[PDB]
Each structure stands twice: as C-alpha cells, then as structure tokens.
Amino acid sequence: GSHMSGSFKAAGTSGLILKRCSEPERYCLARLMADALRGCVPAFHGVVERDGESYLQLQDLLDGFDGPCVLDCKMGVRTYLEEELTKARERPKLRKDMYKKMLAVDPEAPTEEEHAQRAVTKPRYMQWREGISSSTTLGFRIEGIKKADGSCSTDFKTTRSREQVLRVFEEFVQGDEEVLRRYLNRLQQIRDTLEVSEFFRRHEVIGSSLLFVHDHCHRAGVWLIDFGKTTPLPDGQILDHRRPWEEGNREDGYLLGLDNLIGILASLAER
C-alpha cells in the first residue's frame, strides 16, 4: 500500500513518497526519466522543500500492492567507490563501529593492528562484508525482507552460496508460481533494458538495489533503486558491467550479479 505505512518521509500526494535529496541521486534520477531505464526505476517528479530540507518526490513502489512483501537485493561485486580506497590510504577515518560489527560475525577476521586500534577502514569493512555474503562470488546479496505479516529481517550477512540464496527466495515467494514467473519476466526485461541503456554503459553503479515487491493477489514488480553512489565515467569511457573489478577500471560487476540472480530464480522455478 505505502512504505511509510531514516531517509524517507510521507508525501502529501497519494501514491508518492519523499526521500532525502542527495546530489548524485538527483542527477541520476533526472537522467533515468529520459533513459531506456525510465520504467525500471521509480518515477521521479522533482524536488520539494519540507521543514527547511530538500526531498526527492518519488513514486511509492508499494502503492499498487495489497499487503506487499518486499526483498532488497544490493547489486554489484563492489559496494564502495574507488575514492574510498584513496581516502583510506592518504587519510584513513578509523571506524570503531565497523570493528565491533566485524568482530561480532568473525572474531578471527580483524588483523592484530585492527584489534589494537579496535577500528577498521570503511573499504576494508565493506570488502569483508562482500566476502562473507554472496557479493564477491555472485555479484549481489540479499539485504533485507519485509513480509505481509508485518515481520522484517536483515539477518543475511552470511547468506553466500547459490543454494543459500535460492532458499531465501524460495521462502520469500512461498510457492506462488505466478509471482516467481512474473519476477523472472521482469528481470529478463530489465537485463535487456540495461544492455541497451545509454545511462548504464556510461555510469559506475555502486550500492544500488533491485527491490522485489509482491502480494497475495500475485502482483509482482522489480525496480532499481538507490543511485546515491552511481557516477559517470570520465571523457566518454564505458563499462561492460561483467568483467572483474581491478582498482582503476571502475567495474561494478552489476550484470554478473543480475545474470546469477536470473539463474537462481530460473533454477527455483524448475524445483
């Protein structure tokens, strides 16, 4: 029905939502409304001011649905900008929170020096996260589910193997063959759109998600969201979005992820 049902605020207009304006994200949504990918992203209506702050006026993707189930998939083999690697080398901001969150999952993960600092760099933390999830090997990872019964979970930090990922989607679709077939049709059409998109070939797409939304009426949709770390390549250079990331090549592995995601849902459909 609606997401509002901490970047988000309720909109005055029916079927809209407000998201805290960020300059990279605003730039991307404006380009996307004129791109092949227009229909694959939430409608962007422009910027509005609320309590002296800038917000993006977005389509509420949950509006068409009756008690929506939602799954957030973060796309890419890499989940941080290359500029974070430079910053961490020349001017590291040691993160005590990231050390604790790492220690919690694997007490042998931090180095002797990280234990001594009780702190890690952001890129180090995000690289570790990529490796214990499916990000590094499959090019995406499950971040969170919201179920129609009001329940939610973010407990996927060690969801890594092809079969572990399949079991999460299997539980998500709860044997609804119509929802799964509609998800697969939508991902096939999104892949086709990404492969021809002028935007996609000229941008590094980091930290974006695919949002899966379905209901008990068998309505199913998928959209790309979260363009806060999507940036254009300099002087008309392009990415293939499949080849491995090597510092300087700005590759995101986005389509490696989408290929693997389509493969898993196609496998689930035949179970």
Ligand X SMILES: O=P(O)(O)O[C@@H]1[C@@H](O)[C@H](OP(=O)(O)O)[C@@H](OP(=O)(O)O)[C@H](OP(=O)(O)O)[C@H]1O
Q: Is 223 annotated as a binding residue?
A: no
Give Rg (Cα) of the chain. Answer: 19
In whole angstroms, how close is the CB of 176 to Mn ion at the nearest point? 26
Q: Is 211 annotated as a binding residue?
A: no
For residue 141, list its beta bridge partners.
Answer: 74
- CA 88 to CA 83: how far, in whole Å? 9
Nearer to ligand X, 29 or 220 (CB): 29
In whole angstroms, how close is the CB of 123 to ligand ADP at the nearest point? 19
Q: Is 7 annotated as a binding residue?
A: yes
Single residue of 68, 76, 123, 207 touching ligand X by CB under 6 A:
207
Yes or no: say if 126 and 136 are a contact pair by the CB < 8 Å rule: no
Q: Is 101 annotated as a binding residue?
A: no
In whole angstroms, how close is the CB of 146 to ligand ADP at the nearest point? 6
- CA 61 to CA 43: how far, in whole Å? 9
Nearer to Mn ion, 68 or 110 (CB): 68
Out of ligand ADP, ligand X, Mn ion, none, what residue 145 binds, judged by CB under 5 to 8 A for its kind, is none
Q: Count of residues binding ligand X (CB under 6 A)?
A: 5
In the complex, the residues that contact ligand ADP under the rule CB under 6 A are 3, 7, 17, 42, 58-62, 70, 72, 209, 211, 225-226, 228
- CA 31 to CA 228: how far, in whole Å? 14
Query: Which of these, 218, 139, 142, lies nearest to 185 by C-alpha position?
Result: 218
Yes or no: say if 5 and 148 are a contact pair by the CB < 8 Å rule: no
Q: Is residue 157 classed as helix, strand or coil in its secondary structure?
A: coil
Q: Is 126 annotated as a binding residue?
A: yes
Q: Examine residue 202 and tell whether it contacts ligand X (CB under 6 A).
A: no
- CA 83 to CA 96: how far, in whole Å? 21
Nearer to ligand X, 124 or 214 (CB): 124
Q: Examine residue 101 and tell whether it contacts ligand X (CB under 6 A).
A: yes
Query: Which of these, 53, 28, 52, 54, lies nearest to 42 by C-alpha position?
Result: 28
Q: Is 147 annotated as a binding residue?
A: no
- CA 251 to CA 248: how far, in whole Å? 8
**Residues at the annotated binding site for substrate?**
74, 95, 122-129, 229
Which spans of this chain sit near ligand X (rule: CB under 6 A)? 79, 101, 122, 129, 207
